[PDB]
Write a protein that holds these residues in place. Structure first.
Motif, PDB file in Angstrom:
ATOM      1  N   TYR B  22      30.016  -0.707  58.007  1.00  0.00           N
ATOM      2  CA  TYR B  22      30.354  -2.043  57.524  1.00  0.00           C
ATOM      3  C   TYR B  22      29.058  -2.749  57.154  1.00  0.00           C
ATOM      4  O   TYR B  22      28.240  -3.048  58.029  1.00  0.00           O
ATOM      5  N   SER B  52      36.684   0.918  50.954  1.00  0.00           N
ATOM      6  CA  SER B  52      36.896   0.667  52.377  1.00  0.00           C
ATOM      7  C   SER B  52      37.530   1.862  53.078  1.00  0.00           C
ATOM      8  O   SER B  52      37.251   2.099  54.260  1.00  0.00           O
ATOM      9  N   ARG B  89      39.593  -4.538  59.926  1.00  0.00           N
ATOM     10  CA  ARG B  89      38.177  -4.713  59.628  1.00  0.00           C
ATOM     11  C   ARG B  89      37.931  -5.865  58.663  1.00  0.00           C
ATOM     12  O   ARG B  89      36.831  -6.425  58.655  1.00  0.00           O
ATOM     13  N   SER B  90      38.933  -6.240  57.864  1.00  0.00           N
ATOM     14  CA  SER B  90      38.787  -7.344  56.926  1.00  0.00           C
ATOM     15  C   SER B  90      38.708  -8.695  57.618  1.00  0.00           C
ATOM     16  O   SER B  90      38.298  -9.673  56.981  1.00  0.00           O
ATOM     17  N   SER B  93      35.394 -10.646  57.352  1.00  0.00           N
ATOM     18  CA  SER B  93      35.129 -11.483  56.190  1.00  0.00           C
ATOM     19  C   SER B  93      36.111 -12.640  56.050  1.00  0.00           C
ATOM     20  O   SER B  93      35.927 -13.484  55.168  1.00  0.00           O
ATOM     21  N   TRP B 101      39.226 -14.296  52.205  1.00  0.00           N
ATOM     22  CA  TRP B 101      38.182 -13.340  52.548  1.00  0.00           C
ATOM     23  C   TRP B 101      36.954 -13.620  51.689  1.00  0.00           C
ATOM     24  O   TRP B 101      37.022 -13.536  50.459  1.00  0.00           O
ATOM     25  N   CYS B 103      33.154 -12.563  50.697  1.00  0.00           N
ATOM     26  CA  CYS B 103      32.289 -11.389  50.684  1.00  0.00           C
ATOM     27  C   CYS B 103      31.074 -11.625  49.793  1.00  0.00           C
ATOM     28  O   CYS B 103      30.690 -10.782  48.979  1.00  0.00           O
ATOM     29  N   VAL B 115      45.531 -11.673  45.326  1.00  0.00           N
ATOM     30  CA  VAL B 115      46.235 -10.443  45.670  1.00  0.00           C
ATOM     31  C   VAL B 115      47.580 -10.358  44.955  1.00  0.00           C
ATOM     32  O   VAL B 115      48.085  -9.256  44.708  1.00  0.00           O
ATOM     33  N   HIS B 120      51.226  -7.563  44.589  1.00  0.00           N
ATOM     34  CA  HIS B 120      51.829  -7.849  45.880  1.00  0.00           C
ATOM     35  C   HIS B 120      52.386  -9.264  45.904  1.00  0.00           C
ATOM     36  O   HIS B 120      51.910 -10.152  45.192  1.00  0.00           O
ATOM     37  N   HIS B 207      53.487  -3.258  53.116  1.00  0.00           N
ATOM     38  CA  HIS B 207      52.559  -2.787  52.092  1.00  0.00           C
ATOM     39  C   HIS B 207      53.022  -1.469  51.487  1.00  0.00           C
ATOM     40  O   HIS B 207      52.939  -1.280  50.268  1.00  0.00           O
TER      41      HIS B 207
END
Ligand SMILES: C=C1/C(=C\C=C2/CCC[C@]3(C)[C@@H]([C@H](C)CCCC(C)(C)O)CC[C@@H]23)C[C@@H](O)C[C@@H]1O
Lengths: 7, 236
Positions: B22, B52, B89-90, B93, B101, B103, B115, B120, B207
């Motif tokens: 990361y 990722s 893990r997101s 951020s 998020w 970054c 998104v 989505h 998802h």
């Protein structure tokens, strides 16, 4: 192509 | 009330694994296809997720015991859990102030609207953001954060797994480390963390449902990467 050989 | 030397080395290995996989600078993000604002954000977010997934692979390989599993078991665990580890893990951020998020820069700041431009809908993005908020409020230490990712990845109840007993014994040892860490460091949190794993299952479901509609449109599937198509695909 050589693709799961990132095991 | 003391952490054993092997338990301590497990934590050291996981924290070091996460730091190696990361990059807090997000300087690699400039190599993705650029974000633009018909699914204008799909190329950038496809590259982001593909990048990722490869990081999750490197993290999984450095989990103590994971390399001892068969190749098929390692692939099955990663295929089923990759989207969950990415969601976990997101959180690093994610910002409660922005509800997005961040970054490094405005180009690489992703909100819910971004998104939706990747195929989505709010049926996924609303619970995902509520998940990020609830996880952020736990204020997990980096040790707890990486232990939760390793526990999530070493789940025995995943499709395609062969050696269920050996994988559960590895996960059980990770859970004992986490519980012992929490008892030492926090004189209820463990139950909250386990609940987040159940939340990740529901997010995995939604998802996967929405990814199928996306990948069944040739104009969109061709915008994905080989690694995304293989990890998120239904191929067994
Ligand atoms: C990647 C990571 C980051 C953000 C994760 C996000 C933000 C944007 C939208 C994402 C990527 C969700 C999307 C629903 C995933 C859709 C992927 C696809 C279009 C193929 O169906 C999942 C995680 C969300 C940044 C950094 O924390 C690294 C982390 O690792």
């Amino acid at each position: 192509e050589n693709a799961x050989x990132x095991x | 009330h003391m952490l054993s030397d092997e338990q301590m080395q497990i934590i050291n290995s996981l924290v070091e694994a996460h730091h190696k996989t990361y990059d807090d600078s997000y300087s690699d993000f400039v190599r993705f296809r650029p974000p633009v604002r018909r699914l204008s954000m799909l190329p950038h977010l496809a590259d982001l997720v593909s990048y990722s997934i490869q990081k999750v692979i490197g993290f999984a390989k450095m989990i103590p015991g994971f390399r001892d599993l068969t190749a098929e078991d390692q692939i099955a665990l990663l295929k089923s859990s990759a989207i969950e580890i990415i969601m976990l893990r997101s959180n690093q951020s994610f910002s409660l102030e922005d509800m997005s998020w961040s970054c490094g820069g405005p180009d690489f700041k992703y909100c819910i609207n971004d998104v939706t431009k990747a195929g989505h809908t709010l049926e996924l993005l609303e619970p995902l953001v509520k998940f990020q908020v609830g996880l952020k409020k736990l204020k997990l230490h980096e040790e707890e954060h990486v232990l939760l990712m390793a526990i999530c990845l070493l789940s025995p109840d995943r499709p395609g797994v062969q050696d269920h007993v050996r994988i559960e014994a590895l996960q059980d040892r990770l859970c004992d480390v986490l519980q012992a860490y929490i008892r030492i460091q926090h004189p209820l949190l463990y139950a909250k963390m386990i609940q987040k794993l159940a939340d990740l299952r529901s997010l995995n479901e939604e998802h996967s449902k929405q990814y199928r509609s996306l990948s069944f449109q040739p104009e969109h599937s061709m915008q994905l990467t080989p690694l995304v198509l293989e990890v998120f695909g239904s191929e067994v």
